[PDB]
Design a protein around this ligand. Sequence first.
Ligand SMILES: CCCCCCCCC[C@@H]1NC[C@@H](O)[C@H](O)[C@H]1C(=O)O
Ligand SMILES: CCCCCCCCC[C@@H]1NC[C@@H](O)[C@H](O)[C@H]1C(=O)O
Lengths: 583, 583
Amino acid sequence: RPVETEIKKLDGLWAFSLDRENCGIDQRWWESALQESRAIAVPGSFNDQFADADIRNYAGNVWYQREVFIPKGWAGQRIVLRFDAVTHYGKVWVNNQEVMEHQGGYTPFEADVTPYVIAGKSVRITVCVNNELNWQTIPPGMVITDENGKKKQSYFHDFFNYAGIHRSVMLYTTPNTWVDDITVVTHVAQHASVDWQVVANGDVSVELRDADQQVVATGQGTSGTLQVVWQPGEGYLYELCVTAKSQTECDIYPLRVGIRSVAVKGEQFLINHKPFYFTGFGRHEDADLRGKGFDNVLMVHDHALMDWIGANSYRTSHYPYAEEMLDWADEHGIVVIDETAAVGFNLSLGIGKPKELYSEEAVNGETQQAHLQAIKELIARDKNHPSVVMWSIANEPDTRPQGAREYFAPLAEATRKLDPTRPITCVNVMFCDAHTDTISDLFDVLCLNRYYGWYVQSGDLETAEKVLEKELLAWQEKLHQPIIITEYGVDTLAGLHSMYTDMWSEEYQCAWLDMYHRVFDRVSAVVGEQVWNFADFATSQGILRVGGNKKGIFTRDRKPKSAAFLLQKRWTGMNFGEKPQQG
Amino acid sequence: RPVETEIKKLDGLWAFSLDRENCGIDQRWWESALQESRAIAVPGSFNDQFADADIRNYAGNVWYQREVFIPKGWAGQRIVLRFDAVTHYGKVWVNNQEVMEHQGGYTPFEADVTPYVIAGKSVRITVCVNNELNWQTIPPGMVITDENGKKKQSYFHDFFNYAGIHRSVMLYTTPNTWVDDITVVTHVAQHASVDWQVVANGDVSVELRDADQQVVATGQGTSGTLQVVWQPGEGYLYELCVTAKSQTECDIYPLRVGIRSVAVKGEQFLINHKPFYFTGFGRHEDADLRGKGFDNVLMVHDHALMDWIGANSYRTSHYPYAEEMLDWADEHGIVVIDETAAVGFNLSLGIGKPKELYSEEAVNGETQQAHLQAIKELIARDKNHPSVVMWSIANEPDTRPQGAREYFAPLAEATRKLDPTRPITCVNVMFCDAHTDTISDLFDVLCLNRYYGWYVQSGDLETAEKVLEKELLAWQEKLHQPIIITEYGVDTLAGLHSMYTDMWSEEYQCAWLDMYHRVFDRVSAVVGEQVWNFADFATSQGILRVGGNKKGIFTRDRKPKSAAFLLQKRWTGMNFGEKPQQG
Ligand SMILES: CCCCCCCCC[C@@H]1NC[C@@H](O)[C@H](O)[C@H]1C(=O)O
Ligand SMILES: CCCCCCCCC[C@@H]1NC[C@@H](O)[C@H](O)[C@H]1C(=O)O
């Protein structure tokens, strides 16, 4: 992530165009200004932006374009173009010359444009964004076509498939000796932090401070770095200046790092050798009007709501969040379970198609590879953050058909070898209980999604309590692992009230979140709770979604339901980081 | 009220017609079947019944009509036609002969039709209902006209002016020796119950039982009746059979009566020599679709809600309720403050006209007389009910202009002389505080309506608490009287939520009902609380009414807001009939 000692190109509006006939790449639309274009805002999903029904569901090729002035002060320095996130696929051109491409979507991609750019004159930038999903994209999907060439995309996750440019686009400048790769690992017993470095024609000189420039250690090398002697309450974080020296130019890069070591012991999650208890939300990158587009106002407000309601942790649910969320996350010291876009590997979640989930035509080969790629990138971007205490390879995969274990074992192995300093998990779906799941052993923490009283035993608390209890303590006796409930919630209309406290009413969300909390309290292995969704969010059209997913404690415009004050009483009434002693 | 030892004529549908040109009484519409009629349901207000905007606000003359068969078994007995309630004015005809008329509205009126009726053949019944209000109606109003003769009624109360036939119509039969008048007064020290009687050519023999026909006393005469030796929890009530004997026929009439004596001592309301604390609602005779029409299902459900929420008392707000509510009220033993339709005697409640409220053109002469009449009738119908512990002459009158005291003193005197066994009150408006009110001395209990934090000091709890406190203890030091707060509430949209707990949100209704309850708890003279309205109800069109009055704890279809559970926690958490010891 860039700092300096740049011109943020995401300012203002871009030219936006559709490619229904799919003429763009053939007719070389990037070598000219978009014919019949309209203004679009970055960052922001293109679907909700124009109130156009046909634009919202369009599946194909979209074209962004924007001219920019390259500042004169960057004469002999390398000019680099960074896209913090272009959702699903993007191919970037700089003034008649093709520079870059990436099929990531929720992770950045950058390219060196020093030759193709002459600092001082205006150059045009054309981005081709694709929002298609097949079986080798993360998350997976499948497109269908018919007569008239109308393309219709179908996917297997819940949230709506927003696309476009979702995070800032940067255009940064570094001297010809840059610090391309950095790694830092911290230890603590009852300690210090090894440092790393990768550069070109430059030596490494590492120093680190605390409050302000008050160095309290130092080191000269690409290893070791140990010296003098970060909490979930405040979050004390030192500033690690890295220096790369050359004959002519010098480079200085500041990296905030917090001393912490996370490890699992029996059925306890230890951050700095202390048992913890997770409370908070599994949220989404969703908002009114802008899709998954990032915005600072929303981050400030949502963090205010989480601070008020007593949440101490949350999970970047179902895709990598914007890194600003993680910088804030280690600033205010909130625990984060980071997760990849690996979601939807299941054909059993049917609103009420290949024949076997781990066949060749679906999830085999490039699917496993590209999943390992999403791992490699998520870790290569979020490795240094002290707020990240957990890895999460995938979310709710069907592990019942033949070949699921053969799929998930190598990913666990490679991911563990990539970052051994943090525990790893895989959130499993509800249809795979303790007697049918075959993957929960590969991972350090078991994550659970449970909806007893909603999908099954619908509306019956008296029996859903028993089934949840039996399933829970049966998990505990089965694997003797720390179990975090990462999804538990029920849909609720914001204004619907009912004397009988039946489903969809706020009284049922309150009484349903309560029983789950008692069963949570009488189980020793439950190392945390995360009510399903923070706020109501947009999903695809189905007969089970009443204008999106209504399982939020807050509405979409961030207004509280009756459960927000219940949870604010529960989480702030207990001691921070502690679980109730069975009551 | 009739029993026997009848044919309820309110069964099914009646013919309904409008009189826009005002031709009815002139062209003798009762002597024929209504030309161009449509089916209407009794009981039920005619305004909401047809979804017709023009029918709902129509101000003039409406015509009901229904043929009926007079049963053969009533050959030589007197046949009487009873209208339990015809709202505002009614003139009743029986088969080409005019029998009765009444300008009451919320009280019954009956007439002897033995000559005009021959039991065995069908007779027609035509009712002329008027919904107009001038300065001599209770409640008062004033009608305006223009070109095209369009009449437009304006009144000064809040609730909508529903009209029509609102309660059952009876057609009962009694032997030629009937018991026209009965009175019963009960005493209790640390006792018995004098009896009364009025008949024609019949002697009085009085006996009374308990559970079933188990007489535990007796008496032969029209006085005395004292013998052996009713609570707000259950409500034990004896059965008093009255007998009127003649040479040929005999009459037996059962009257339930509960032993109780209510009296005010200093600043305490004593029912059976015990200090009390009022909790509950000031409700309305309003419902979806039927206007003010009575219905048993609604009474059962609303009594279920009041029983659940912990209410022990309520006030028949702004008009005499249906007597079934009072029979239920003494059955389950709920305390009732009975009130007349005397409401709207104020020109200061302006949404933001004569010149002085007690002039001759407005409130003078027949206005005072007819008010005394509404008194006389309310007392003549609800005198024997043990559930009625209080008289309430009027509600929110402007007592600031010259001549208010000269108006209200004689009504208090005559009303006290009519029923001295129960305390009397007058609910005063907010604009007349302790330093400006001039009538609160005439009455036994002072009733208060207060809206600090809503109309004045809007949205500010920190100062509305001080103003409410100062006003309250200043009342206490001023008159040293028992003060019941009979109206305190704020409007609330059923589904509107807000993190800032500002006005119209459920959080503001909760936090606003709470502060009022603390200030209630630190005042010794407050002998009860009644949150303003039980359920949202229909009012006239104004810029302050969002589809009616939203100051209800429940919605109109009887669905709870966030305050219903708060009040259910407060009222059932305290001991029944007791006020918290300042906390
Ligand atoms: C026995 C299993 C019956 C069906 C259970 C389905 C659970 C699927 C959980 C789903 N997991 C994905 C999440 O985004 C969705 O919000 C959540 C949902 O349902 O809305
Ligand atoms: C200082 C006085 C400022 C204005 C206060 C007005 C209080 C009127 C109280 C009114 N009393 C009558 C009742 O039916 C209505 O529901 C209630 C209301 O407001 O809605």
